[PDB]
């Protein structure tokens, strides 16, 4: 919400009311600088050790 | 007394007296908690109770309801010597004369200890304590 327009007011109300953020939003993951759940990053890639012996 | 209970903490009545005042059996001197804890916590040294030089050891304290140092020492030595002698030459057969004579000897020993005499008979009483302990071990 703070990213769009009124940054300082939203931040001040957030800190005042002890607000918590889930941090799965788009802009949130952008600001923190790591992978977001969009497209390629909307799923994790794993490894199966039982498949290496195939 | 309410005016002497620790050379550093002699008047703690208006400071909420919530600390106890321990007494070491080798000094017979009152020391408050925060002082004695540092005393035996920094090492077994003597307390400065009016220039006291007898070393205060770690732990081995006691609570005192105050019955004067004379009677407290006489009851501590009385109980200790009573345990050293145990029931030797006492309730062995039922005699009353020799029993009262032996009790007279024990009370005379405790008397010589509480009076000290000349630091000569009391040492013989200590050797008597070692002999009685050797008899109780066997």
């Amino acid at each position: 919400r703070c990213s769009f327009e009124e940054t300082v007011e939203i931040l001040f109300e957030a800190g005042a009311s002890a607000e918590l953020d889930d941090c799965r939003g788009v802009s949130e993951n952008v600001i923190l600088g790591q992978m977001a759940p969009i497209g390629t990053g909307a799923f994790d890639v794993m490894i199966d050790e039982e498949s290496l012996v195939k | 007394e309410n005016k002497d209970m620790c050379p550093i903490c002699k008047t703690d009545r208006y400071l909420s007296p919530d600390v106890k005042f321990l007494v070491n059996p080798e000094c017979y001197h009152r020391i408050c908690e925060s002082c004695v804890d540092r005393i035996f916590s920094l090492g077994p040294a003597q307390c400065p109770y009016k220039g006291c030089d007898k070393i205060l050891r770690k732990n081995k304290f006691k609570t005192q309801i105050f019955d004067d140092v004379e009677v407290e020492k006489e009851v501590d030595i009385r109980k200790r010597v009573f345990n050293v002698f145990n029931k030797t030459i006492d309730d062995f057969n039922g005699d009353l004369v020799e029993y009262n004579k032996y009790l007279e000897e024990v009370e005379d020993i405790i008397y010589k200890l509480d009076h000290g005499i000349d630091v000569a008979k009391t040492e013989e009483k200590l050797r008597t304590y070692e002999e009685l302990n050797k008899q109780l071990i066997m």
């Binding site: 759940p37 497209g39 390629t40 799923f43 890639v45 490894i47 498949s51 | -």
Partner: protein, 83 residues
Amino acid sequence: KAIPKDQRATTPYMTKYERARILGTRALQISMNAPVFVDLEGETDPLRIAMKELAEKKIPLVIRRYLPDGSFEDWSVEELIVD
């Protein structure tokens, strides 16, 4: 909390994003000296080798599809129908 194999109700087809990340991660491993499971026809580029392994389903990976309620599923890329 890991939905079992008899209750996996997601699409069995591999999406373009799953194929993309599988070819990207697999090609990245091949570039980092990974054991190749397919005989090469003379290729040098790692992406072509990754697509060669995807064409024969020799890629040893399994996808953990996250569900919106917090759960997930394990769809191996060998059982996923490509294209």
